[model samples]
Target: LVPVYIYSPEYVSMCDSLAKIPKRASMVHSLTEAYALHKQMRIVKPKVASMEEMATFHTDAYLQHLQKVSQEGDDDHPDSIEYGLGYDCPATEGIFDYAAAIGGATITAAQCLIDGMCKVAINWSGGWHHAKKDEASGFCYLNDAVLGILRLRRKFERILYVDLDLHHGDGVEDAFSFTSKVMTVSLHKFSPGFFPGTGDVSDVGLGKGRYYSVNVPIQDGIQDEKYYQICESVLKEVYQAFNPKAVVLQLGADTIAGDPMCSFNMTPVGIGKCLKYILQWQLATLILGGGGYNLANTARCWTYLTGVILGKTLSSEIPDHEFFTAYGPDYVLEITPSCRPDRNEPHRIQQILNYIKGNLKHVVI
Candidate 1:
């Protein structure tokens, strides 16, 4: 069985975080349908990671600040607002512990991949990529992807981070910018007023790590073919250029068509191609989650991804899950034409190609 690391009680919190079913686990639990189908991947329950473990990436001050807020409810720590703790990231009880659990699970996944315990190691809930060393952003209070990457460093010399999330993986990109040992490539919806307005096409890496980063800022209404083409073209060049020894693939469900927050039309099949590329790359790859808001869509989207990794094509017939009713008459493990308008046109695709090709020109042995 594939080793899947999940958490214990109260680690996965909802907190009324969104509309259309909010942030409850009812929708996320739909993956249990696949878990049941697999006769269950070996359950690797995560333990609470120590503060010392967190310090491998996060600062001591930031850890103390988060713990204090989790204990005192952020009222006394107005500065917690600076850390993105008030709204998108709730300052609830055991918040620090919850992050530790997720972080530990992520680190454990890396360990498994490095030690050959599993060809594919997954922590489906451990993709909180927006948090920084000192502050939280975009609902991500802890940057587990960084922790996992660092753990992988103990084994491999080079790593490639591929993000399929709708938003930019700023935290991860920033954490590794100082080192050429890691290359970060993010494919996201980039516009003037997008959330976390970073990851511009021209924004490759800096100094010794120049040309080690690639940002595919796409337009909306991108279909499965266009999405796959962009991913294929860019990945072909980047992988040929870098030939990274390891990889971290973040698969956020937000890029799906109906996500309220994003405008992209990325379907599960389209993203499956994305995931399939990384898997076929034949590297020790770490999987992560990011910004999927539409519950029914995100639920199905993630389930399909897990199925692909498990070497199983999921049944279109959605069976009884923890929240089977959450998927109403639209009962299926796929996305439909309900996708948003297609903003990614030929010229836009050309723009992205020219941008990526321009950056690729600078990299070599």
Candidate 2:
């Protein structure tokens, strides 16, 4: 059976409080409700990660600045601009502590898989992939996904990272840009010119790691069927080329319908289908939750993923009343119905998939 960890801290200081309410709805609170519906699911407590472990991926100067900001309980320090810590990544009390807990929780899951405690481990708190080594980006602080890879490296020689976020997994790619042991594959809705724009198809890896990194930049409004086809084709090529010993999947829900930041309109079913494809590969896999706004949608998307992981399927009907009440009256209506702006561009999804199939070159390792 797969072991999943739910790490719920008292507060997450770095994230906007309003964002956290819905953003966190899926992994922690929704999973709790899923447990009530299905008793056999496993939920484990999380431990906090030490500062030393986080240092593996973050720079010392950046860490010091963040600590100072945390101490002051203020967001607007001059040093914040130098460290990329204000506005998008504003610092609040316990910011470091919150990020560290999530990082530690991800490390714990990786450890469990390495120690033979389970074949698959899901840590929803982990996938902060947008965070850079020396600066915070895209609302991520310490980059737990990068730290998890570093932790796994102590035991495994080769690791495969698949990120399905709306935005590029630039931070993770940057972290392992020069290492041959880790192969990072990312599929995202990347406009030609955008924030943190760097995931180009031609920008493979550097030196010994050349061609080890793969990217498939897609167009907007990608549907369930087309996304699955792309996943099937690209992942097959990845497995053949990299032959990695273990795989880590970053399941970012922003690709789903009605994400404020993302232009894509993928359904929860699409996300679940992609995960099922990953499971079929039979490698030691760790799943980390990533970006997804719209609390009800995020909850349903991940809950559906959890069901798929457990070899079950969720009903397409509206979730139970308790699930509705979790987010209060503001979330009473079913978001999925109204969330998507009619699938008018279904063919666009196929066009992107076909483009990826034609352009991607399998690396000869």
Candidate 3:
């Protein structure tokens, strides 16, 4: 945690939750079933990103404004708002340094992939999907997924960026809108009233990236099977259509059952299965973290998903950690925080599929 502890509870809570992740990681390692995960993890130590490193996906002016606002811990500068700061993205002390560390993690993961240290590298701190090149958004201050994809481009000709966050990955989509080398697919809540309300079924892409961008917009109460079906369909189709050399997967816990803002009704097991689907493609894969408001659920989701990525069949019986009591029942790991009424019907999901399939003729549904 390179950033200053903030005055706001939201930021502090998120920081607190993230702080426990290593504990959770340790807890995962403690599970007898998953005891050998370290055998697969390369565990590369990350470095703080230089300003020049950040400039790969962000504008120079925006980075300058970010440095000034973050260093001063004051958002009063007009440039703050000009660059989408001081709103959802705060000018908290250590903001730039915090972002640098997260960005550094993803870039390092990319470097590891290029070096062939591991088949799958995960940076649980990265994946702030809503941050724009010149603006902050949706509580995201920096867009690291873009830099991850760009970093992969060093040895990859095509990369597929997939976001499973509750909210749309507008920042990531906008970043590569005109490139053929990168294809972005975002599955999110997309009501007109949703916060930041941008991803729609029709907003494919700009001039060159038309079909290159894919959006799977949902209303409310999307459960496990439907979520799996939709993700499996699109991933199968998208992989065949694009044939990308590498893949980036963003897992947002906000889409889980009890997140403050999300309405999906999925179980952790189901989501992990979706990730299992992503892994089968055999492309170089980078895993990143995203939104999950219910702090406990976020930790749980990532912990479970981490096990899935390691190809481990870890037990739900969570073991002792400093934060062990934070989990209910004191043992089980497959925790579903809270859920919504299941509203996404079969016909409705099929209609959603029909719309997406309309765009693809190459996929063998």
Q: Estimate each model's TM-score.
A: 0.92, 0.87, 0.88
lDDT of 2: 0.73
On lDDT, who's better, 2 or 3?
3
Each prediction's whole-model lDDT (CA) = 0.79, 0.73, 0.74
What is the Cα-based lDDT of residue 298 in candidate 3?
71
| Model 3 lDDT, residue 118, Cα | 69
Name the candidate that leads on TM-score.
1
For candidate 3, what is the lDDT?
Answer: 0.74
Arrange candidates by lDDT, highest first: which order? Answer: 1, 3, 2
Please identify model 3 stretches exceeding 4 Å from their true place: 1-40, 329-331, 337-339, 362-365
Q: How many clashing residue pairs appear in each of the predictions shown?
A: 4, 0, 3
In candidate 1, what are the lDDT values of residues 175-230, reduced to their tens digit? 98777888999998899998889998988978888888889998777778989989
- State which candidate has the highest lDDT: 1
The total number of steric clashes, by the backbone 3 Å criterion, in model 2 comes to 0
**Cα-based RMSD of candidate 2:** 3.5
